[PDB]
Amino acid sequence: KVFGRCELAAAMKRHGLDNYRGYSLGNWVCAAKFESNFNTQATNRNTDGSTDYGILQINSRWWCNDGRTPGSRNLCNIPCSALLSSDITASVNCAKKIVSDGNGMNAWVAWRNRCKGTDVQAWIRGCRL
Numbered sequence: 535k536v537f538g539r540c541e542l543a544a545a546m547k548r549h550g551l552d553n554y555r556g557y558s559l560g561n562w563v564c565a566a567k568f569e570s571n572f573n574t575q576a577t578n579r580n581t582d583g584s585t586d587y588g589i590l591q592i593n594s595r596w597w598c599n600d601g602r603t604p605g606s607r608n609l610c611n612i613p614c615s616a617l618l619s620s621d622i623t624a625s626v627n628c629a630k631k632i633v634s635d636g637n638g639m640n641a642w643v644a645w646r647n648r649c650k651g652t653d654v655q656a657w658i659r660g661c662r663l
């Protein structure tokens with residue numbers, strides 16, 4: 535599923551991501567924009583052999599099981615394919631664990647490089663929320 539901007543903002547809010555660990559909704563929408571262009575089916579292989587999955591590009595090195603990332607963990611206790619669903623529940627619940635791990639949203643390199651310190655509220659501007 536390719537979400538609309540305001541559609542994803544609303545789904546993220548319903549799932550409790552708005553202001554989760556202090557990160558306003560626009561931060562999450564901005565991260566999803568640059569990680570996946572709002573496409574739940576996005577996958578990308580990393581140089582270390584792990585793969586990133588879903589709207590928030592969650593990595594198989596630590597967070598989900600894909601059966602092909604040696605020495606990895608599955609800290610969200612989910613198959614990585616669950617992060618590709620049109621229903622964002624699995625991605626949101628796993629993202630909550632990631633953002634609580636110590637470094638906040640810096641876990642998402644694209645958030646740090648493209649959203650952090652910008653006017654992230656623009657990503658939810660105009661949305662009925």
Ligand SMILES: [Cl-]
Binds near residue numbers: 655
């Ligand atoms: Cl915001």
Ligand SMILES: [Cl-]
Binds near residue numbers: 643647
């Ligand atoms: Cl980047």
Ligand code: NA
Binds near residue numbers: 539
């Ligand atoms: Na957009």
Ligand code: NA
Binds near residue numbers: 599600603606
């Ligand atoms: Na894994």
Ligand code: NA
Binds near residue numbers: 599600601604605606
């Ligand atoms: Na594996």
Ligand SMILES: [Ru+3]
Binds near residue numbers: 635636
């Ligand atoms: Ru850690």
Ligand SMILES: [Ru+3]
Binds near residue numbers: 635
């Ligand atoms: Ru930890």
